[PDB]
Design a protein around this ligand. Structure first.
Ligand SMILES: [Cl-]
Ligand SMILES: [Cl-]
Ligand SMILES: [Cl-]
Ligand SMILES: [Zn+2]
Ligand SMILES: [Zn+2]
Lengths: 104, 112
């Protein structure tokens, strides 16, 4: 029900990001979501945006915007500490299983 | 340093046949590798068709392709679209819960 750009904007602010980005919602044949550090563009797969539950979208957007905040493409302790401000390890396990069950 | 030679990609049909053998499935299946917008893999009981996303088949490592195909073919073996204890029983002959979480995270992080 909540517009996808409103969700992205809420996450940019809750992550305390103060660098403007571009948001593109488009069909994507190779990915669900991506972030270009060169053009500061967040790309979200249109089908996923229109068909995945809000919590899965939250997790997906957080993944990309945490990379942008910490200026790292890796998923170690700096990434994990940012994600833990939103979802516990057990909550991430449940979301990750739900995303897989939507793909296969 | 010199890059270690990226080993010859196993043909998708060979990955499928190895799983049908290990799962002891002698029912015939159709394999469709096509662009898919909604999923990366599916299985139709109506036509006995394993559907695989074309970009995924051409770019994912063997370990991820094996896991994805194994998931669909376990459903076909147990004659259930669900992930009950009968699904877990077949999957556990291949991977522990921790190993499944690891591979599933690699799949997710190929797409996000
Ligand atoms: Cl694309
Ligand atoms: Cl980039
Ligand atoms: Cl283990
Ligand atoms: Zn990432
Ligand atoms: Zn399934």
């Amino acid at each position: 029900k909540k517009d996808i750009k409103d969700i992205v904007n809420e996450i940019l602010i809750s992550l305390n990001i103060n660098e403007s980005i571009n948001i593109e919602i488009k069909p994507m044949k190779q990915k669900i979501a991506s972030f270009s550090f060169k053009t500061k563009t967040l790309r979200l797969n249109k089908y996923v945006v229109e068909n995945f539950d809000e919590e899965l979208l939250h997790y997906i957007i957080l993944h990309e915007l945490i990379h942008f905040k910490i200026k790292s493409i890796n998923h170690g302790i700096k990434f994990e500490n940012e994600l833990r401000n939103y979802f516990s390890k057990n909550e991430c396990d449940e979301i990750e299983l739900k995303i897989i069950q939507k793909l296969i």
